[PDB]
Symmetry: C4
Subunit: 185 residues, 4 copies
């Protein structure tokens, strides 16, 4: 007889709400989480990535509500530094093959406990970190093997507002949703 709470994305288990209430740091993977997993490449070496505006708003709400937001990704691109800058994200880790290193560095840097960390991932590479945190999240269309492992599976797909969904959940859990705002720096 699990207890659930209605949210604007559907019912969420009380255990998940309780985990979300302790979050002081949200860590996000990029490709497949903030985007639908696509990398656009051109003939003169151009590269584009598509980000979702609604996720941006969620990220700003967290940051303005004293909840740190960090990024850990295996890829490396100037465009992501630009994106992080527009969102006010100062903790960006690119070109990371082993995500635990960046994760442990964040814990020490921010003097945060693992139970105070939420992590949104989409592939197996994310699991070693997700296995240790207070709130592990797999996006709706994450690799099938990651889905049953996470504390929460988002209703929204990667690149369509899965990050916003987790931002909304964390703020709801901490009774900060009604008053939160996400204006730019």
């Amino acid at each position: 007889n699990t207890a659930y709470i209605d949210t604007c994305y559907g019912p969420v288990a009380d255990d998940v709400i309780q985990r979300a209430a302790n979050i002081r740091l949200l860590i996000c993977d990029v490709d497949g989480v903030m985007s639908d997993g696509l990398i656009y490449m051109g003939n003169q070496g151009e590269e584009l990535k598509a980000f979702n505006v609604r996720d941006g708003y969620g990220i700003r709400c967290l940051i303005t509500s004293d909840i740190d937001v960090a990024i850990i990704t295996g890829r490396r691109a100037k465009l992501l530094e630009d994106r992080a800058n527009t969102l006010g994200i100062t903790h960006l880790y690119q070109g990371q093959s082993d995500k635990l290193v960046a994760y442990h560095e964040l814990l020490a840097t921010l003097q945060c406990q693992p139970e105070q960390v939420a992590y949104i991932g989409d592939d197996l590479i994310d699991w070693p970190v997700m296995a240790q945190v207070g709130l592990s999240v797999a996006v709706a269309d994450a690799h099938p093997l990651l889905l049953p492992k996470a504390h929460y599976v988002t209703r929204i797909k990667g690149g369509r507002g899965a990050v916003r969904e987790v931002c909304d959940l964390i703020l709801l859990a901490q009774d900060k949703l009604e008053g939160a705002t996400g204006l730019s720096i």
Copy 2:
């Protein structure tokens, strides 16, 4: 209850909604998630792209040529949007607006429109302060879940896929101007 509905090419529409659309003299659109899918394309050399829908363009032209004003209010700022606005003949463009109510009040004052004569299409919470005040508030099909139950009308078509066109068509139909409209 027993609500009356009018059949439209997008499905049944409440009579209440048809009456609201019948009085529209100004359509205000948010951009990201309304005229687009909600995505921003960013590149390594600082390039930025946004994708607009051709079908929306046609609808906007039908409104403008039918003496129905169209305006854009957005918190973002990009030359690409000035370009898009120009191609559509939109002369009421407001970018970098953190408080959308400022631009909204200026438009009503300058265009001599009453709030009941204004329609607004949004996709997120920042659009609600303006939507709360207008005659026809519209949330796109895939708008943030919290906005959906608040709007007078929710489009069947998703943001960036013709949700703007759908509203343009609804307004024209409600005013007996759908047939004969050119865009």
Copy 3:
């Protein structure tokens, strides 16, 4: 009504017969060869996305002695490039009244209206579609256009709706297997 099975599902015998007479395929661009999106950038860049399977269908028609033309209201050099990569030599851009180009194609190619197929996605395409042998609306064309066409594709614009019509025409003309 008699239906004939196709790799896209049953097609009415009436449509197969119409397809069998086609000598010219005319396509609109936005919403037909693409999903209706136009990408715009801050330095004035513009992109449009085309479907590779559609390209193959077009080449099959051209090599099977069936002409392929394009009539669009927009104008962009990117479209000239696409047309050229497909071997399309009949391209009409910046066309406000699509009937003008249509009547010109009939003359240039000494073609009859019943020998023309037209794939559209919006109301501006109807004046021409109303007059041809095989009018086609893409799966996700404007709702008002859908019930007016002789055939509605199962595949959406930009996802292979053009290839579908190409396959249908060739099937009807016993030219599919050898294409």
Copy 4:
């Protein structure tokens, strides 16, 4: 009474599993397989193609598991050489009008039997090669006429992780899935 094996993508026939167990070389077509079939063209002659990071991880898993990966396409673009370089793919054939020419070179140079080859296609142009291999694969949204011809039809659409799905199947079939390692690029 066909026997099936449950995979993270759903049941897979025992016949397909046995075919996947013998694979030493995976050949991929590009457009509609590694991408959703779209070509982006610009007014200044720019050209872009979008690849999926989930597929990159699968390819790296194959290569690091001593399973070769090759690409054969009729198109030609510098962007594809760039994508192949990022994935460590060294067997790249572009502008190939007759795909069988490249296919025969690969088997000869790699000392690989047709039965040891898997090929992922999306259109009729791919059939001459698929007809000859041990594991022919059509992506979920491949041209309708190719679907009934392949040994296996992927659950995932072109450009959304159909390649990854095949990489996972081959590894599972060879008991190398759990130990597989790759990078989300």
